[PDB]
Amino acid sequence: RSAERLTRILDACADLLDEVGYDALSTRAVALRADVPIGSVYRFFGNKRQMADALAQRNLERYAERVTERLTEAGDGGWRGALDTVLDEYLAMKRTAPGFSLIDFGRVAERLTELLSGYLGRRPDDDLRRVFLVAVETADTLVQLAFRVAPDGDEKIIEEARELLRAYLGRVLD
Amino acid sequence: ERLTRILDACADLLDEVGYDALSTRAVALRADVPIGSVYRFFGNKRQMADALAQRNLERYAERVTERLTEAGDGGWRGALDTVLDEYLAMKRTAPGFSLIDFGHRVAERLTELLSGYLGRRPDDDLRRVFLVAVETADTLVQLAFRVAPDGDEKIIEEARELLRAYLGRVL
């Protein structure tokens, strides 16, 4: 039930992020929205930043579960589908997951390197860890770009990023 | 005269103090100009910093143009190399350029500078390709200087492979 309250605190924190943003956010508003004793929230989190980190952390586990289950159900072992899955699930969260434009995953490249290299039957050496870091950093910047260009994510920017990443992985993946 | 030294002082101080510790007072002091002279050109540090960035861009563009006119062959690979190598030389050598570099504006400028050179029409597609390429390169170069203070060469090379892979498909 302590865990039940945490879920709710984090959900309210996610929702509040979309409504008033990070600066206006306060611990009392979260507790009222979550319908939790205000003392619970102060007990769980030292400041707002800590609550935001727990939310970010929860975003990443959810994304990792989503991707792991898409790859498990319909993956064919290939990097094109793997790439579409990670990118599309991240785009869906970006559009659909509360507070996600403000609080992302906060590490990600590491988690994705583990996840994907297992799936692809590839040895995560330095070269491959670098490729992944490069891919993840560029996808982050291009996704951010797409959403500055149009509020739901400019489709042409997104499609350029997809093409860009396919060309790169097509070139560097042996 | 005074404008030049104000921007020189702004560029250095950036490097010595960082952006938000940077103040109009400190720049005037460094530039050997009355504080009032700074306010004659700029109402605030953000305008001052954008002015510096605009100067950076003019210099970058003239270096690129000179390099391309001297030894360019009309091909996208040497243009990519020039454009990327000149930016990297500036990150390492140009004052303040790590903390304020170019201030769309870069992408638009490169489109103008490079579209005639390459025989490519400056349409919306080319603009978008350049915008994606600039944003990518910017993040990847930031990444490279985060991993080593001279710019991590293996990151730099991945970025170069990545941009060649993209442009070769898309051009």
Q: Does A168 touch chain B (CB under 8 A)?
A: yes
User: CB distance B140–A161 less than 8 Å?
Assistant: no
Q: Residue window 104-143, chain A: list those with CB within 8 Å of chain B.
A: 130-131, 133-134, 137-138, 140-142
A172 chain-B contacts, CB cut-off 8 A? 158, 161-162, 165
Which of A90, A13, A94 lies closest to A55, judged by CA?
Answer: A13
A25 CB-near residues (< 8 Å, 6+ apart): A13, A16, A17, A48
Method of elucidation = X-ray
What would the two tokens of residue B2 be?
């005074």
Residue type, A87: L
Q: Is A157 exposed, middle or buried (0-12, 13-18, 19+ CB in 10 A)?
A: buried
Pair A55, A104: CB distance under 8 Å = no
Tally of structural domains, chain A: 1
Query: For chain B, how are helix, strand and coil distributed in percent, rounded to 5?
Result: 75, 0, 25
What CATH number should be reported for the domain holding residue B10? 1.10.357.10
CA atoms within 13 A on the CB side of A171: 20
CB atoms < 10 A from the CB of B1, how many?
A: 6
**Resolution of the experimentally solved model in angstroms:** 2.3
Range of the domain at A82: 1-174
